Write a protein that binds this DNA or RNA. Sequence first.
RNA 1: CGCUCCUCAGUACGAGAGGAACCGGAGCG
Length: 149
Amino acid sequence: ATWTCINQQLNPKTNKWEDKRLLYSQAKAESNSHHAPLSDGKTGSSYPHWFTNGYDGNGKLIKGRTPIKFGKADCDRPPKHSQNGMGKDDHYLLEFPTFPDGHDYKFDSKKPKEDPGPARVIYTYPNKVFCGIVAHQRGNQGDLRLCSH
RNA sequence: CGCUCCUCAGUACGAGAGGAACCGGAGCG
Ligand SMILES: [K+]
Ligand SMILES: [K+]
Ligand SMILES: [K+]
């Protein structure tokens, strides 16, 4: 499919704060999460890595929080995250950068860190069940939000 | 001792969405 993500970017090809409308191919996003390692950010970029989605390692939900209205089960099922993330029983949401040109992220180069952009593909652990494509509202930082489609 | 860079380490430690230090290396005061 294809997800529409809205984001405010300071179009360096201008400088000003512009309201871009990015379109992502669900197919390509999934491809991304597959070519991506199945670990909890112990890579140079730090991706992919756990997306708490408002939760804690227990499955209990953090104060003043509200999970992403994902839809499909699993994705909305309180996670279970244990330290290395590699809990022989754990199950949680991972996040990885995804881009409109749906190229695979250089997950291992810190210094210099390939800019991860505003969007990420969220998929289950350890089955990589695509959940959705969320993105920051302003720039490539801040609070994540589930885009439309 | 102070500052820049590497490294430590995307580690430790986090979960307001991130993220140190000590040791060590290069340099300036
Ligand atoms: K971690
Ligand atoms: K340092
Ligand atoms: K040092």
